[PDB]
Structure formats: structure tokens, C-alpha cells
């Protein structure tokens, strides 16, 4: 019923490492096929990339 | 001599018809939204460093 | 007093953080709804009919609501209501 996708802000500075371990936790924390999903296709996209 | 139409004397059950044309209106109730600056909206990926 | 919150070990006790409940987060998604349409609307051109997109009060309407569950839809009397009624005229044998 609520599923995610990524904010993109300009004024948002942050460390690259931030991205990098996000991928990894994103694989552990959510549910992308199956019977449901939490996430949309391009937020997997980019989790997939990171 | 011009061959277009411009000035004609009609009867008045003739002036309606010119209605020949097909017309396509959208709903009151959608909505009509320009997105092409929204191809620009972005951000860039900074590299590890040192 | 339930048997899942049994702990026997340190290992599941940590600092507490923050706190939440359900009337807070019922207001939040829905601030949260209107605030992205009411932003996207905002920042391009749009032709459409106008909505003011507000937030109400959740609280108010439940509360609301069950209070109309202590209505009645029948009344008590004593007598019932009179039906016919009668014009008296110049006669004195028909009404």
C-alpha cells in the first residue's frame, strides 16, 4: 500500500560512503518481487547502482 | 479573382452548416502539466577523495 | 506481562531513542501526501479546477463518530398524534 522512492535534493552535501553503504542495507532491509514490494522499479535501479 | 470563399449570402436554416470539424476536449476534472524543465532536475556523484 | 517481552539477556536492551503513536502518524501521512502534490503543483505550470488541499482534524471526525452511535431514531409518547378532524357547518346532522 506505501512504497519508497529517492529524494533528490541540491542542497543536500553528504559523503559518498553514505551511498555506498545504503546500497548494501537497502538489500537487507526491503522487499523487491514475489507476492509484494516495498520499493518502486527505478528506487531498485538505484540501490542496484549503488 | 480570388477562388477562396470569403463573402457568402446564406439562408438562415444554412448557417449552421459549417459545424464539420472534429474537436478533442480534456475533463474540467484532469489536469494538463508542462514537465520539460523537469528534464534538468539532477545531481552529481562526487568521487571518493584522498 | 507478555511472554515475548521477557528478557534474560543483555543483548536486546538499548537506549531509548524516540517515541510514536497512531493519531501522530495518521496526521503525518497525510501532511505528507498533500505537501508533495501541493509542491509539484507549485513548481510547474498546470491547467486544471482549483482544490485547496488541507489537512483536517482525525481526532475531532472519530470522536465524531461515536458520539452519532448514542442517537435514536424512535420517540416515546403517550397518546399518538391526531389524524382526522372535523369543519362543523350551518348543519346540524353532517360534518
Same mark, same amino acid.
Given at each position: 500500500?506505501?512504497?519508497?522512492?529517492?529524494?533528490? !535534493?541540491p542542497?543536500?552535501?553528504? !559523503?559518498? *560512503?553514505?551511498?555506498?553503504? *545504503?546500497?548494501?542495507?537497502?538489500?537487507?532491509?526491503?522487499? *523487491?518481487?514475489?507476492?509484494?514490494?516495498?520499493?518502486?522499479?527505478?528506487? *531498485?535501479?538505484?540501490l !542496484?547502482?549503488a | 479573382?480570388?477562388?477562396?470563399?470569403?463573402?457568402?449570402?446564406?439562408?438562415? %436554416?444554412?448557417?449552421?452548416?459549417?459545424?464539420?470539424?472534429?474537436?478533442?476536449?480534456?475533463? %474540467?476534472?484532469?489536469?494538463?502539466?508542462?514537465?520539460?524543465?523537469?528534464?534538468?532536475? %539532477?545531481?552529481?556523484?562526487?568521487?571518493?577523495?584522498? | 506481562?507478555?511472554?515475548?517481552?521477557?528478557?534474560?539477556?543483555?543483548?536486546?536492551?538499548?537506549?531509548?531513542?524516540?517515541?510514536?503513536?497512531?493519531?501522530?502518524?495518521?496526521?503525518?501521512?497525510?501532511?505528507?501526501?498533500?505537501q508533495?502534490?501541493?509542491?509539484?503543483?507549485?513548481?510547474?505550470?498546470?491547467?486544471?479546477?482549483?482544490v485547496?488541499?488541507?489537512?483536517?482534524?482525525?481526532?475531532?471526525?472519530?470522536?465524531?463518530?461515536?458520539?452519532?452511535?448514542?442517537?435514536?431514531?424512535?420517540?416515546?409518547?403517550?397518546?399518538?398524534?391526531?389524524?382526522?378532524?372535523?369543519?362543523?357547518?350551518?348543519?346540524?346532522?353532517?360534518?
Open positions: 500500500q506505501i512504497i519508497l522512492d529517492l529524494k533528490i !535534493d542542497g543536500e552535501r553528504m !559523503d559518498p *560512503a553514505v551511498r555506498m553503504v *545504503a546500497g548494501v542495507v537497502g538489500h537487507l532491509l526491503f522487499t *523487491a518481487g514475489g507476492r509484494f514490494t516495498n520499493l518502486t522499479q527505478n528506487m *531498485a535501479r538505484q !542496484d547502482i | 479573382f480570388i477562388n477562396k470563399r470569403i463573402v457568402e449570402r446564406v439562408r438562415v %436554416g444554412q448557417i449552421l452548416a459549417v459545424l464539420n470539424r472534429r474537436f478533442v476536449a480534456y475533463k %474540467g476534472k484532469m489536469r494538463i502539466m508542462d514537465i520539460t524543465q523537469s528534464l534538468k532536475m %539532477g545531481t552529481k556523484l562526487a568521487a571518493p577523495t584522498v | 506481562q507478555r511472554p515475548e517481552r521477557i528478557k534474560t539477556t543483555p543483548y536486546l536492551e538499548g537506549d531509548v531513542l524516540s517515541s510514536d503513536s497512531g493519531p501522530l502518524l495518521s496526521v503525518f501521512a497525510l501532511q505528507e501526501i498533500m508533495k502534490v501541493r509542491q509539484v503543483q507549485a513548481d510547474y505550470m498546470t491547467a486544471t479546477r482549483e485547496d488541499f488541507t489537512v483536517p482534524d482525525v481526532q475531532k471526525i472519530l470522536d465524531d463518530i461515536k458520539a452519532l452511535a448514542a442517537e435514536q431514531v424512535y420517540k416515546i409518547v403517550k397518546v399518538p398524534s391526531i389524524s382526522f378532524r372535523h369543519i362543523v357547518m350551518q348543519s346540524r346532522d353532517r360534518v
